């Protein structure tokens, strides 16, 4: 069989009432010829790409047609807490909530997904995620590849695992609360190993790691380079050439890659050094999509300069906030031993060389920040508005991967896990790696968040977030 074409999310803009309609519902998808119940926005799986323009407001009407509560968070978008869609932004089953987004940040590829309390991992695993394309006046003057679905394509990469009857097999239990939910099947915009036909010249890929727990590392099958032009929060100052591109859960990068006649190539993901993530078929480079060149000229450019990146300010006198992540040692050991028992030594490939005792021992609140599992009723602190702060996030104490995400901002990384950030990670970010070490980021919050609709800060390894590794904070 030929490969299926890469599905392209619809690019959605407002109506004359300046509204975008999103319906959240359950439907059916097919994977490897077996049907599965899946959830989507405006469809059965995944979602559209909502297009936003800096300095323009849009209203989004969100209809929850599931039979359980959900929320909708705009990951990467800087909006007041009242419309941020964290766990307090409940949408009742069968109900509607509307939000007005006043877009006030540079061009970037952001995304949106559920943030239901304690259930975010399951609702993402069932299929809910969408995209956000922010444009501004500056980016259009660059004349980047811009034909949506032709030379400008989103690539949402996610793993799933399925039970024998075809259904998605999601369980939040001691082992996945320890190591994360991961599977053996890789999806690219919902499809297994699709092909994308691209014109000759530059192809722009907007990459999103939409996995619950798996980190990825993109490369090409014939070692042609990727030119990074943008990170989570928008353009870099100039392109950064890379041979491989690590992407943590919830992160985005946009890259340009050359397309040459007669020479198809794959986008692949290379094995990572993360517990559990190098079990077959991920013990070897794994294709994500085939790029099929078409002998029609692509008109996009890769300019020498993309944007201006301001200097870091002086750090003296800035408020320093400490965020100590932690896991329960007993439950970490129990979950890691179940992983080893199931898959054996391969569950640590690439790494450096039973009774009920009550609620005190419940894994659902085993993961914590500053000694507390997420308490929706008690924001941990009140951050300053319009002031830079230095947030120091420590994973010392365990060796699991914590891609740490802060709502309400695009920050600058000062230290990523004990080293200055790589050049393609030195621009605007909303995620920073923490793994066995300490990171420090420079953040500023331009919008208010009250206690009733607080901003979240958490690990984007969803099973850890859902089992307590999140805090709430207010701004203003
Ligand atoms: Cu997110
Ligand atoms: Cu977010
Ligand atoms: Cu979040
Ligand atoms: O998130």
Curated annotation (Swiss-Prot):
<comment type="subunit">
    <text>Monomer.</text>
</comment>
<dbReference type="Pfam" id="PF07731">
    <property type="entry name" value="Cu-oxidase_2"/>
</dbReference>
<keyword id="KW-0677">Repeat</keyword>
<dbReference type="InterPro" id="IPR011706">
    <property type="entry name" value="Cu-oxidase_C"/>
</dbReference>
<feature type="region of interest" description="Methionine-rich region">
    <location>
        <begin position="327"/>
        <end position="359"/>
    </location>
</feature>
<dbReference type="GO" id="GO:0030288">
    <property type="term" value="C:outer membrane-bounded periplasmic space"/>
</dbReference>
<dbReference type="Pfam" id="PF00394">
    <property type="entry name" value="Cu-oxidase"/>
</dbReference>
<comment type="function">
    <text>In vitro, in the presence of excess copper ions, exhibits ferroxidase and phenoloxidase activities. Fe(2+) is an excellent substrate in the presence of excess Cu(2+), but is inactive in the absence of Cu(2+). Oxidizes the phenolate iron siderophores enterobactin, 2,3-dihydroxybenzoate (2,3-DHB) and 3-hydroxyanthranilate (3-HAA). Oxidation and thus inactivation of enterobactin could protect cells from the interaction of enterobactin with copper and play a central role as an interface between copper detoxification and iron homeostasis.</text>
</comment>
<feature type="binding site" description="type 3 copper site">
    <location>
        <position position="458"/>
    </location>
    <ligand>
        <name>Cu cation 3</name>
    </ligand>
</feature>
<feature type="binding site" description="type 2 copper site">
    <location>
        <position position="405"/>
    </location>
    <ligand>
        <name>Cu cation 1</name>
    </ligand>
</feature>
<keyword id="KW-0186">Copper</keyword>
<feature type="binding site" description="type 3 copper site">
    <location>
        <position position="113"/>
    </location>
    <ligand>
        <name>Cu cation 2</name>
    </ligand>
</feature>
<dbReference type="InterPro" id="IPR002355">
    <property type="entry name" value="Cu_oxidase_Cu_BS"/>
</dbReference>
<feature type="binding site" description="type 1 copper site">
    <location>
        <position position="402"/>
    </location>
    <ligand>
        <name>Cu cation 4</name>
    </ligand>
</feature>
<feature type="binding site" description="type 2 copper site">
    <location>
        <position position="73"/>
    </location>
    <ligand>
        <name>Cu cation 1</name>
    </ligand>
</feature>
<feature type="binding site" description="type 3 copper site">
    <location>
        <position position="460"/>
    </location>
    <ligand>
        <name>Cu cation 2</name>
    </ligand>
</feature>
<dbReference type="GO" id="GO:0016682">
    <property type="term" value="F:oxidoreductase activity, acting on diphenols and related substances as donors, oxygen as acceptor"/>
</dbReference>
<feature type="binding site" description="type 3 copper site">
    <location>
        <position position="75"/>
    </location>
    <ligand>
        <name>Cu cation 2</name>
    </ligand>
</feature>
<comment type="function">
    <text>Multicopper oxidase involved in copper homeostasis and copper tolerance under aerobic conditions. Is responsible for the oxidation of Cu(+) to the less harmful Cu(2+) in the periplasm, thereby preventing Cu(+) from entering the cytoplasm. Probably primarily functions as a cuprous oxidase in vivo.</text>
</comment>
<keyword id="KW-0574">Periplasm</keyword>
<dbReference type="InterPro" id="IPR011707">
    <property type="entry name" value="Cu-oxidase-like_N"/>
</dbReference>
<feature type="binding site" description="type 3 copper site">
    <location>
        <position position="407"/>
    </location>
    <ligand>
        <name>Cu cation 3</name>
    </ligand>
</feature>
<dbReference type="InterPro" id="IPR001117">
    <property type="entry name" value="Cu-oxidase_2nd"/>
</dbReference>
<dbReference type="InterPro" id="IPR045087">
    <property type="entry name" value="Cu-oxidase_fam"/>
</dbReference>
<protein>
    <recommendedName>
        <fullName>Multicopper oxidase CueO</fullName>
        <ecNumber>1.16.3.4</ecNumber>
    </recommendedName>
</protein>
<feature type="binding site" description="type 1 copper site">
    <location>
        <position position="464"/>
    </location>
    <ligand>
        <name>Cu cation 4</name>
    </ligand>
</feature>
<dbReference type="GO" id="GO:0016724">
    <property type="term" value="F:oxidoreductase activity, acting on metal ions, oxygen as acceptor"/>
</dbReference>
<dbReference type="GO" id="GO:0042597">
    <property type="term" value="C:periplasmic space"/>
</dbReference>
<dbReference type="InterPro" id="IPR006311">
    <property type="entry name" value="TAT_signal"/>
</dbReference>
<dbReference type="InterPro" id="IPR008972">
    <property type="entry name" value="Cupredoxin"/>
</dbReference>
<comment type="similarity">
    <text>Belongs to the multicopper oxidase family.</text>
</comment>
<feature type="binding site" description="type 1 copper site">
    <location>
        <position position="459"/>
    </location>
    <ligand>
        <name>Cu cation 4</name>
    </ligand>
</feature>
<feature type="binding site" description="type 3 copper site">
    <location>
        <position position="115"/>
    </location>
    <ligand>
        <name>Cu cation 3</name>
    </ligand>
</feature>
<dbReference type="GO" id="GO:0046688">
    <property type="term" value="P:response to copper ion"/>
</dbReference>
<dbReference type="Pfam" id="PF07732">
    <property type="entry name" value="Cu-oxidase_3"/>
</dbReference>
<dbReference type="GO" id="GO:0004322">
    <property type="term" value="F:ferroxidase activity"/>
</dbReference>
<feature type="domain" description="Plastocyanin-like 2">
    <location>
        <begin position="199"/>
        <end position="264"/>
    </location>
</feature>
<keyword id="KW-0732">Signal</keyword>
<keyword id="KW-0479">Metal-binding</keyword>
<dbReference type="GO" id="GO:0005507">
    <property type="term" value="F:copper ion binding"/>
</dbReference>
<feature type="domain" description="Plastocyanin-like 1">
    <location>
        <begin position="27"/>
        <end position="137"/>
    </location>
</feature>
<dbReference type="GO" id="GO:0010273">
    <property type="term" value="P:detoxification of copper ion"/>
</dbReference>
